[PDB]
Amino acid sequence: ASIKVIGVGGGGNNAVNRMIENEVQGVEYIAVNTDAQALNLSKAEVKMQIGAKLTRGLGAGANPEVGKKAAEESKEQIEEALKGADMVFVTAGMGGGTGTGAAPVIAQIAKDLGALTVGVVTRPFTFEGRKRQLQAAGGISAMKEAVDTLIVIPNDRILEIVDKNTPMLEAFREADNVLRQGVQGISDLIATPGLINLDFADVKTIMSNKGSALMGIGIATGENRAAEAAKKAISSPLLEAAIDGAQGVLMNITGGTNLSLYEVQEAADIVASASDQDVNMIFGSVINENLKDEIVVTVIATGF
Numbered sequence: 001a002s003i004k005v006i007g008v009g010g011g012g013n014n015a016v017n018r019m020i021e022n023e024v025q026g027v028e029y030i031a032v033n034t035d036a037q038a039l040n041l042s043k044a045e046v047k048m049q050i051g052a053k054l055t056r057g058l059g060a061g062a063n064p065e066v067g068k069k070a071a072e073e074s075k076e077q078i079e080e081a082l083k084g085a086d087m088v089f090v091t092a093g094m095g096g097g098t099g100t101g102a103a104p105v106i107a108q109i110a111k112d113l114g115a116l117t118v119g120v121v122t123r124p125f126t127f128e129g130r131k132r133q134l135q136a137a138g139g140i141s142a143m144k145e146a147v148d149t150l151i152v153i154p155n156d157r158i159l160e161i162v163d164k165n166t167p168m169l170e171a172f173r174e175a176d177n178v179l180r181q182g183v184q185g186i187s188d189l190i191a192t193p194g195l196i197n198l199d200f201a202d203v204k205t206i207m208s209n210k211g212s213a214l215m216g217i218g219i220a221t222g223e224n225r226a227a228e229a230a231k232k233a234i235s236s237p238l239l240e241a242a243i244d245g246a247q248g249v250l251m252n253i254t255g256g257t258n259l260s261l262y263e264v265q266e267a268a269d270i271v272a273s274a275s276d277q278d279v280n281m282i283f284g285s286v287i288n289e290n291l292k293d294e295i296v297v298t299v300i301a302t303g304f
Contacts, residue, residue, distance in 0.1 A: 001200060003191045004088045005183055006030045006110075008103040009060075009067070010038050011093020011122055015179035017043045023290075024184050026191025027089075030081055032106060034070045034098045035059035048081060050074035050102060060097025064135055067101025078109050085115040086200070087190065089183045090147065092139075093175070095124035095132035100139035107146035116204055119147040120182040122175055125155040127168070149207040149302055151215055153178050153238060160237040178238065182215050185252040185298030189284035196264075198282045206248035206280055209303030214239050214246075218297040226253070226263035229297040230270040239301065244276050247303035251283035254298075256291040267297055 005027050007016035016029050020043040031042035032050055036057030039047055049057060051070020060066040071078065082088060088110040092099030103119065110117040121143060124132040143150050155175050159166075162174055189198060218233030220226075230253075234243050243249065253259075253267045264285045272281055 001086045001190065002084050003027045003187060004030060004082060004085045005187070006032055006088060006090050006106060007042075007044070008032045008090060008092040008106055009096060009098030010035065011096070011099050011176075011179065012091040012103070013038050013042055014176040015091050015183065017041075018176050018180040019184060020044065022180065022184070024187065027187055032078075032102065034067060034102070046081060048074070048077060050078070060101060062131075063097045064101035064139060067098040068105055069101075070098070071102035071105035075105070075109060078106055079113070082110050082113055082115065085110065085113065087116045087118070089118050089120060089187065091120045091179055091183055093122045093124065094136035094139040094143075095128060096135070100135050103139065104142040104146045107143060111146060111148070116207060117147045118186065118207055119143045119150040120179060121150065121152055122179060123152055123154045123156075125159070125171065144212070149209065149213050151182050151213045151300060153182060153215060154240060157237040157240070178217070181217055181298060185215070185300060186250060188254065188286045189250070189252055192286065194284055194286050196284050198284050202282055203250070206250055206282060206302055209247050211302075211304045213300060213302040214241060214304065215301070216243070216299045220295055221293045225293070225295045226267045227270060229253075229295045230267040233297040233299045234271060234274045239299070241304050243271075243274050243299065243301050245304055246275065246279065246301035248280040248301070249275050249282075250300040251281070252286065252298040253283070253295065254286045254288050254291070255295040256293065257287060257289055258293075259285065259287060259295065263295070271299060
């Protein structure tokens with residue numbers, strides 16, 4: 001399968017770098033930006049400046065309309081870069097000019113090419129202000145029309161997970177990590193050939209529900225790590241509605257070389273048990289030789 005991750009605007013730029021830093025395999029990275037400076041800080045092999053004539057590489061100035069026009073100017077280039085993709089992830093923060101405006105255009109392009117297209121976006125922090133919140137609402141509803149499934153991460157909820165003393169700067173940094181965890185949760189079960197690699201066809205069916213999608217993450221160590229992580233993931237503040245209200249649940253459990261089948265099954269039980277009896281649920285596992293004693297459980301819940 002040909003899997004592409006497109007980061008769009010600053011928010012997406014940081015998520016993509018974060019995936020590359022964490023050596024996420026089996027995917028092609030495309031950084032898309034209107035801001036030449038930020039784009040030059042991208043680690044992606046493909047760097048695509050959009051709206052060069054409109055913006056002159058200066059960014060979209062917080063205007064979603066400029067980001068939209070910028071992607072339309074470059075739509076032929078966008079089509080070309082996406083050609084042959086079976087799945088694409090369009091990742092962006094909502095609220096500013098480029099992510100809000102170009103991500104829907106880039107998502108629709110990917111959708112019209114026949115790719116299974118998943119959007120993974122952040123809803124901005126309340127502290128970012130009303131203008132960002134309003135523009136983010138517009139982007140989110142525009143994104144919904146343009147993707148097969150839209151995972152929305154509420155940044156405010158990150159504030160409930162990190163320490164009360166966390167500086168704003170590290171709050172943003174953690175938002176970059178949650179976005180990345182969103183994409184990798186799904187992509188690792190598909191792109192990288194794992195022991196219980198679920199078929200693209202059943203992923204296609206989970207990822208084709210209407211309504212919105214949400215995510216939960218759980219991390220635990222040592223004795224009882226699988227159970228602790230799964231319970232943390234299904235009760236994650238990131239997961240705004242209860243997981244029982246979802247048709248289709250994807251579960252990714254990742255651990256070091258010491259991850260046992262018993263662990264995978266235990267985690268999967270808790271998640272299946274926390275869901276509706278009639279849920280379409282798939283789960284996979286992945287081995288990360290960089291993790292020692294920690295286990296990560298990622299849950300994606302669709303069709304709320």
